[PDB]
Write an enzyme that holds these catalytic residues in place. Structure first.
Site, PDB file in Angstrom:
ATOM      1  CG  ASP A 120      39.938   9.690  33.192  1.00  0.00           C
ATOM      2  OD1 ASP A 120      38.728  10.073  33.170  1.00  0.00           O
ATOM      3  OD2 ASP A 120      40.871  10.409  33.630  1.00  0.00           O
ATOM      4  CE  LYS A 155      40.101  -4.382  28.023  1.00  0.00           C
ATOM      5  NZ  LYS A 155      40.435  -3.063  27.366  1.00  0.00           N
TER       6      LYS A 155
HETATM    7  N1  LIG Z   1      46.161  -5.504  25.580  1.00  0.00           N
HETATM    8  C1  LIG Z   1      46.511  -5.962  26.854  1.00  0.00           C
HETATM    9  N2  LIG Z   1      47.457  -6.842  26.992  1.00  0.00           N
HETATM   10  C2  LIG Z   1      47.792  -7.295  28.182  1.00  0.00           C
HETATM   11  N3  LIG Z   1      47.151  -6.843  29.257  1.00  0.00           N
HETATM   12  C3  LIG Z   1      46.176  -5.945  29.155  1.00  0.00           C
HETATM   13  C4  LIG Z   1      45.836  -5.479  27.915  1.00  0.00           C
HETATM   14  N4  LIG Z   1      44.853  -4.622  28.068  1.00  0.00           N
HETATM   15  C5  LIG Z   1      44.563  -4.512  29.331  1.00  0.00           C
HETATM   16  N5  LIG Z   1      45.351  -5.296  30.014  1.00  0.00           N
HETATM   17  C6  LIG Z   1      45.258  -5.441  31.407  1.00  0.00           C
HETATM   18  O1  LIG Z   1      44.678  -4.298  31.875  1.00  0.00           O
HETATM   19  C7  LIG Z   1      45.327  -4.042  33.153  1.00  0.00           C
HETATM   20  C8  LIG Z   1      44.889  -2.786  34.088  1.00  0.00           C
HETATM   21  O2  LIG Z   1      43.732  -2.199  33.593  1.00  0.00           O
HETATM   22  P1  LIG Z   1      42.462  -3.151  33.144  1.00  0.00           P
HETATM   23  O3  LIG Z   1      42.333  -2.982  34.685  1.00  0.00           O
HETATM   24  O4  LIG Z   1      42.558  -4.719  33.659  1.00  0.00           O
HETATM   25  O5  LIG Z   1      40.949  -2.476  33.316  1.00  0.00           O
HETATM   26  P2  LIG Z   1      40.128  -2.353  34.630  1.00  0.00           P
HETATM   27  O6  LIG Z   1      39.737  -3.709  35.260  1.00  0.00           O
HETATM   28  O7  LIG Z   1      38.811  -1.653  34.210  1.00  0.00           O
HETATM   29  N6  LIG Z   1      40.981  -1.444  35.728  1.00  0.00           N
HETATM   30  P3  LIG Z   1      41.796  -2.361  36.832  1.00  0.00           P
HETATM   31  O8  LIG Z   1      41.473  -3.805  36.760  1.00  0.00           O
HETATM   32  O9  LIG Z   1      41.522  -1.819  38.248  1.00  0.00           O
HETATM   33  O10 LIG Z   1      43.307  -2.182  36.608  1.00  0.00           O
HETATM   34  C9  LIG Z   1      46.711  -4.739  33.160  1.00  0.00           C
HETATM   35  O11 LIG Z   1      47.000  -5.354  34.321  1.00  0.00           O
HETATM   36  C10 LIG Z   1      46.550  -5.726  32.092  1.00  0.00           C
HETATM   37  O12 LIG Z   1      46.537  -6.942  32.716  1.00  0.00           O
END
Ligand SMILES: Nc1ncnc2c1ncn2[C@@H]1O[C@H](COP(=O)(O)OP(=O)(O)NP(=O)(O)O)[C@@H](O)[C@H]1O
Ligand SMILES: Nc1ncnc2c1ncn2[C@@H]1O[C@H](COP(=O)(O)OP(=O)(O)NP(=O)(O)O)[C@@H](O)[C@H]1O
Ligand SMILES: Nc1ncnc2c1ncn2[C@@H]1O[C@H](COP(=O)(O)OP(=O)(O)NP(=O)(O)O)[C@@H](O)[C@H]1O
Lengths: 302, 320
Positions: free
Chosen positions: B240, B112
């Site tokens: 959150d 990420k």
């Molecule tokens: N460890 C993980 N394994 C698989 N997917 C993950 C994991 N961590 C986060 N995600 C992803 O994180 C998602 C939602 O929150 P994450 O969004 O992508 O952060 P964000 O971009 O800051 N908020 P948002 O994109 O609006 O949902 C899910 O759809 C996953 O795809």
């Protein structure tokens, strides 16, 4: 686990650096030919470690490698494997500016920026000659060239193949220039004397067939050097007396010709049994000197 | 054998190069009896300016920085992850995306992109988080942080954190929810709902009647992690964060795969738990045979204490 333990930090960086560049190269395909940009090229890495890996290395240092592709080619053309070259620099600290690798296979020479510049001036022509003579030369074999930066001080180094055997002890140096120069009552106060021309005549029997290949080689080298307006080299010579050596396991006068690339056995009909080492050294700094020197060497064989 | 670090963007190349570089460096560094305080302030920095050399995949000029390397190597060790493995996952083939939400080509790890502020928050919580992974032996629904890096390409800085994937690297997620337990209307959008695999939210889940039936000894292990995890987060002024829930449908997973073999002419519902680490089977007597994946993510008039409690109740209720 390669700690890079070495007396001087600058040595640690050399180890770290050779290790780093060779691993990085092992990931760069070996090309079908060298290219012009290869001869203008380098690799630069700056390291900044903060509270980490501080044990043997400095935390802050730069490592620069000149024309990495060319020198990896030269290495190949000299029959040296990259992993071996790497093990010889990294596996143990090099030892005693003039260094040998722990295993005495390779020499590390500290040099001036003018030399590095001179190296650049000659390198393409010098490479083309290694090609044309299929690596069979008495010229110095340039294995890699680096700029280290430790504590804001820059240091340039060239790695070459050792002229002497990596095992067989040497018992008399001779630096043969081809004007008079001898050894110093101050330098003769050291264990292994570096004698010159005058001292050589004042004090080598390989046969007639090795002469017919040594001179074949030597004369072509000296030619190439002339046309480069290069002058002021020596021919370095080494002598290993076997009898004295005696006073599982290897034996006397036993060596690997593919490792001790300059080593020549003595004739049967010859005074003492000995092994000689001969190659051209110190070329980074014409015709008169080439005729005058080439004739000097020819007058040292039978 | 040769690692080209070939990738869709130069940034990912540099990512590959850098993970490769650091893991290799680290291999030359002994493994300490304990971590020391400075290990948590430590970093490595590398700057490459190549010239006319090695330019096929990497940029000629880039920087790579790794945070508290010793501390992340240790995290990796405690999460049962070999460094050679980790390295092969990032470097064997390019990671793929969903910059700036990547997966390793083999779907073990998630990369990420984060903010500078996030990186700061990691430093704040890192000493505590580590100690937590110690007393809980690596058993937690929290994110497993494996590495943190800063990349510099074209003079731009990009911050990335590596976690283990919540989802299976093998099994297919057919449905997913992101749950906070909030009071506010949390539903998936019109756009979301039409997506391929929509990310559904609390109210979707609720208005849908889904429960998850995992059965007792599983439910208990889970709820115990959750209580301990959220109480740890609440302690560390954290809010959150969501529970990420993927559902896998075994039947649908047995048919979908039976469609590839047929058109290709021209076990089932199980997993290594040492790998798919957040997976639980559905209860012996449940309708559909199903695999669930549930972990907390996103930890970088409501206060943290109340959000901890609240979140825990909703979560503790999402499954019978
Ligand atoms: N460890 C993980 N394994 C698989 N997917 C993950 C994991 N961590 C986060 N995600 C992803 O994180 C998602 C939602 O929150 P994450 O969004 O992508 O952060 P964000 O971009 O800051 N908020 P948002 O994109 O609006 O949902 C899910 O759809 C996953 O795809
Ligand atoms: N390939 C090699 N193998 C073994 N020894 C070598 C090799 N190359 C150079 N040397 C040695 O390195 C040396 C450098 O010579 P340097 O003698 O100290 O000349 P100098 O002009 O008298 N000293 P300086 O005042 O620094 O110019 C000699 O001892 C050589 O034998
Ligand atoms: N333009 C830059 N060039 C070089 N380094 C930079 C630059 N900008 C920021 N940095 C460094 O990159 C860092 C990483 O982001 P910074 O997020 O705020 O981490 P931090 O949380 O401040 N680290 P820490 O103090 O251990 O908690 C900064 O602190 C600076 O050291």
């Amino acid at each position: 686990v390669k700690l890079f333990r070495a007396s001087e930090p600058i040595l640690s960086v050399l180890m770290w650096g050779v290790n780093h560049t060779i691993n990085e190269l092992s990931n760069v395909p070996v090309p079908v030919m060298l290219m012009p940009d290869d001869f203008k090229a380098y690799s630069k890495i700056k390291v900044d470690n903060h509270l980490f890996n501080k044990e043997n290395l400095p935390s802050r240092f730069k490592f620069k490698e000149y024309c990495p592709m060319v020198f990896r080619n030269l290495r190949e053309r000299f029959g040296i494997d990259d992993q071996d070259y790497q093990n010889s620099v990294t596996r143990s600290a090099p030892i005693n500016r003039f260094l040998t690798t722990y295993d005495r296979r390779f020499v590390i020479k500290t040099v001036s920026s003018e030399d590095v510049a001179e190296m650049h001036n000659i390198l393409k022509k010098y490479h083309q000659f290694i090609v044309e003579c299929h690596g069979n030369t008495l010229l110095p074999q340039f294995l890699g060239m680096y700029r280290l930066t430790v504590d804001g001080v820059e240091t340039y180094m060239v790695v070459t193949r050792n002229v002497f055997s990596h095992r067989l002890t040497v018992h008399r140096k001779y630096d043969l220039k081809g004007v008079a120069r001898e050894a110093s009552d101050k330098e003769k106060a050291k264990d292994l004397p570096t004698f010159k021309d005058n001292d050589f005549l004042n004090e080598l029997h390989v046969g007639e067939e090795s002469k017919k290949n040594f001179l074949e080689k030597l004369k072509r080298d000296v030619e190439f050097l002339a046309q480069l307006k290069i002058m002021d080299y020596s021919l370095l010579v080494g002598i290993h007396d076997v009898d004295r050596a005696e006073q599982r396991f290897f034996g006397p006068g036993e060596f690997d010709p593919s490792v001790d690339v300059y080593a020549m056995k003595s004739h049967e009909s010859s005074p003492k049994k000995e092994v000689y080492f001969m190659a051209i050294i110190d070329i980074l700094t014409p015709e008169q000197y080439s005729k005058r020197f080439n004739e000097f060497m020819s007058n040292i064989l039978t």
